[PDB]
Amino acid sequence: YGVVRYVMESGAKGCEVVISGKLRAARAKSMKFADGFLIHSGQPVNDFIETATRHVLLRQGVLGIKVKIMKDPSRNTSGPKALPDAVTIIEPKEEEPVLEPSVKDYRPTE
Amino acid sequence: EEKGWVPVTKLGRLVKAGKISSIEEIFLHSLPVKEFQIIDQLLPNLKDEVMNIKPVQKQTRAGQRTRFKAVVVVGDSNGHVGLGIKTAKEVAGAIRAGIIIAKLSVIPIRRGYWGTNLGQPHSLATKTSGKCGSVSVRLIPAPRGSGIVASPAVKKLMQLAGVEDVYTSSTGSTRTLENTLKAAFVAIGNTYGFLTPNLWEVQALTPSPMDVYADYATAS
Amino acid sequence: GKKRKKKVYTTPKKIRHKHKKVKLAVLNYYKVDDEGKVAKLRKECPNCGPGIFLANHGDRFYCGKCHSTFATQK
Amino acid sequence: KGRRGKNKRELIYKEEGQEYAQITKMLGNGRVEASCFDGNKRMAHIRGKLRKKVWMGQGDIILVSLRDFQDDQCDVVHKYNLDEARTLKNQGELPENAKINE
RNA sequence: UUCGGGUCUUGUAAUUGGAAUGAGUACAAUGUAAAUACCUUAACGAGGAACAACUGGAGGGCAAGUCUGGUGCCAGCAGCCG
RNA sequence: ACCCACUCGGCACCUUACGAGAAAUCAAAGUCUUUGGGUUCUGGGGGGAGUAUGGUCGCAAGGCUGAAACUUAAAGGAAUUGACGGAAGGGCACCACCAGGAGUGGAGCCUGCGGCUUAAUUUGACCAACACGGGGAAACUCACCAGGUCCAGACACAAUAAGGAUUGACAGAUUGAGAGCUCUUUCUUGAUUUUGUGGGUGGUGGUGCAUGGCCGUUCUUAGUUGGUGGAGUGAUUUGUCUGCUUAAUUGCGAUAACGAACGAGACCUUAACCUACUAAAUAGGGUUGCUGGCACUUGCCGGUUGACUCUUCUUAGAGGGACUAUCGGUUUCAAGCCGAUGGAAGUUUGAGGCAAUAACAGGUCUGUGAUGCCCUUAGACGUUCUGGGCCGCACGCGCGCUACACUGACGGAGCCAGCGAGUACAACCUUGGCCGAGAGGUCUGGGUAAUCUUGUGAAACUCCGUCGUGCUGGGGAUAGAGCAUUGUAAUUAUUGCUCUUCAACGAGGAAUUCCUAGUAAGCGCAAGUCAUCAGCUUGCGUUGAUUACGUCCCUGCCCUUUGUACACACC
RNA sequence: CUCUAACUAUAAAAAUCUCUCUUCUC
């Protein structure tokens, strides 16, 4: 939870840490500790989500740790700047339409 | 702690602006409470203790889904009690959510006199009862310095209430701890819920402090 | 997924070929001429160089500094 | 149902209070009765580690341990699956008055 | 500026002293019909104060071990769950 | 007789909880811890058991009365979620069926299992094991077996010990050995050692039911989850739904639900379309030279690192292009579904890659210097060397191969591809010219790669002939001999080629597999393995269809409803 | 602010099931 809190503090929009092995017991276990949200399928999985796996040597054996971090698309250099389905509509600038007749003249220019 | 908190829930706006000195008017005017820091701000002296966490188990096609139901009790030891019941996946999350629930459900008590009053009433005003499931709980006024003659769970709840002497009489399947605590809680909440004589006279029907301060709520 | 039988041996023993701790081979090698000249014994190695004594087995004097080089009849 | 389970051995000889016996019939409740090769019909109990792990049936030479206080009963330990039974007959540790072949 | 005075206290040490005293002996006296014993009291009577506290238990119920070694659904434990 | 407003009494009913209950529910099962209207009769855990016995009524059947000894930690009630149902409903799937196509199962061969045998036939998987562990093992790979070596036993301490800890050793005996393995002797070597104690390494030793990682499967379907919010005392539930719609929990919507997250899609690779752009002797084309042949009219077909020019074809970047477009039907007219036109493409455009929560005692310690524990650690389970086996054979089973011939076999002749790959610290792809019948060898070449192999001039196929219904020129196993090739080593036949032998086989029982368009099927080719080896496998292209374009009947799957004594869940 | 009309039509057979049940504390 310290790790995931640090990841959120760092500004990424989603973290997950998975620990499997002999968690304090003999029968195998695998607990997941996630926050934010993570995308699993679709090529953006490689585009943003960094992943690492490590083996930890404890007295009883080996614990597998998997870390997944979903980098913010906004600050992703060298790749798409947003998710595939992220639609950004743009606010149209407003104008007053009362100027109906409004004859105008410029000076002639060469 | 970074307690930023944009005000929600106009009551919250009033307390944040400090227009609510403490909970008595709230409880007086039966205000709705939906958020906990209202209790935190008004009562800065809530002590808490997780009575029991139970592994609650559901059966699905792929193994079994396990959650944890915490039954936590919060109080001031000076006449305010709340009880939170909450299930969640992780134990710590369950405990925190239960804490929030308990602070949401703070209820007052009527510390009465066993007879021939002195300073600082110790016992309960009147015998009360509460039913949850098969758990029927009786609270009886007790002579000063008789202690809290009660089962450990409700005894701790009484201690959190601030009461010093009460007699208890349970019936049913009190083994079920959440039912017992919930019954004792509704009973102790019933302590006001009993028109005693000395409380006869018509009151003045004070204007709702939450009403007359409407202009400080609903942030413009 | 298998339990192994004990390696029973139908072979008596083979022990390390212990080197022989020779007591003062140099007196065997040399011969002193009464507080003066000293002679060597049984040959000197020409293939290895002066000072390396050779081996006496029979009908052949043998090397052993460069062992395979010199084993010749004399 | 092998996924629920724990998932060329050698014979073991009797040792000072145990005997090879031939089951004569299989009794209920998990019991059994076997002739020990002494001229006696003893009552064997199917021991733990054995109950529903490895089976046995009639006409099977099988090791059984006696209980020192009550000789009339005994508890079966180790089974022999029809090929080292011939070896048991060969080595002559037990009398060959009982041959079992199909 | 790291300090570190332990400056004030608490504990922990097979380190180390001198105090105090009974259980036991026992002069006596008292106590009793006679006596024991007590209540007093000479002189004796503590260093590891060997002048030695056991009885159950440490998964839950229920306070206390996921320490070591042994046995390996056997021996056994367990009022019940195990 | 009806209508209205009644009222008294009766069977009942609906709504609700503001009362109860543990709930299902109850207008009484309320007026019960705030415990008292009057009253009878029953029960005190379940079994034993309404049984024993004695009465008592009865003809009899039997009824009423009615235990105990003893045996157990439960039995039981209501509801919740799953599972299950030869329960219901609505939808799906060629790992289901229908219409069929191709077959497999019969035959011989190959290959992998089991069994048997063996010294060893090393081993692990039993829909999701079986042409799988890339497992196409001659030495190695190595795991087993008969054997021989060596220590790749760090470091600490002690102990010997420099008058030598020790090592190495020609020749012989001995050894398969040209091993100083052991011995005979003698030499050589010098503090790195040796032998005892710890201690550590090593291990294709064991334990996938200690484990990580890994992938497989549940599960190619569409399903998951939390936050406040409501319902419940709670197990939980609603959101996640009545309907219609989609391939989709996909939407239209309806809604104690609201807004959110994953999965699906979206997205990426590939396949297609770009006379639009950018360009090109490592791709092509035109003109034009110089040349070859023919017709002779200036026409063709050719060659040619000549010159100029071009980019349609070939490349690959930028991009463009389709989103159901347009229209006609149908649709609470919305979601969409159908039909035609335009088009290149109108099934999600085709095929794919990633692919949720939860889980399996699924497999893997035999991939790992991933790894806990245990085992062994000197005549070793370390490592190496020689040889054997993993490929044996009374038998059964699974992938596949060649066939059973006339749509054929054998001769000629025609002559079209697409994915690849390729020599370095070594030695590949090999053109061409030689020779040989052939496999082959030979000498020079090119090619580190759109350049050369290469236009891989491949097969089926196409055309002309021979054969002629014959187990026949079908079929080519099983069998002798020879020539070569890789290899230190081909015997237990590596492989190729040559001759001869020609077996079994007549469309294959019950069953069962796969499949809806460039599809199945036939046909090969390239790559992995590789020194040599494929019948395997990935990919590629070629010749290219019959039959659906639907349904839950078998086998399953989604969700909903329902019932359950199930929860290790109908095994 | 006026109303009460449609409807069909199935059942053959299918018995049994050996283990192994294992924590939630911040």
Ligand SMILES: [Mg+2]
């Ligand atoms: Mg998504």
Ligand SMILES: [Mg+2]
């Ligand atoms: Mg398993």
Ligand SMILES: [Mg+2]
């Ligand atoms: Mg037994």
Ligand SMILES: [Mg+2]
């Ligand atoms: Mg004492």
Ligand SMILES: [Mg+2]
């Ligand atoms: Mg004990």
Ligand SMILES: [Mg+2]
């Ligand atoms: Mg003790």
Ligand SMILES: [Mg+2]
């Ligand atoms: Mg305790």
Ligand SMILES: [Mg+2]
């Ligand atoms: Mg009873």
Ligand SMILES: [Mg+2]
């Ligand atoms: Mg009965």
Ligand SMILES: [Mg+2]
């Ligand atoms: Mg009777």
Ligand SMILES: [Mg+2]
């Ligand atoms: Mg029930």
Ligand SMILES: [Mg+2]
């Ligand atoms: Mg069919």
Ligand SMILES: [Mg+2]
């Ligand atoms: Mg075929």
Ligand SMILES: [Mg+2]
């Ligand atoms: Mg066949």
Ligand SMILES: [Mg+2]
């Ligand atoms: Mg074998």
Ligand SMILES: [Mg+2]
């Ligand atoms: Mg499947």
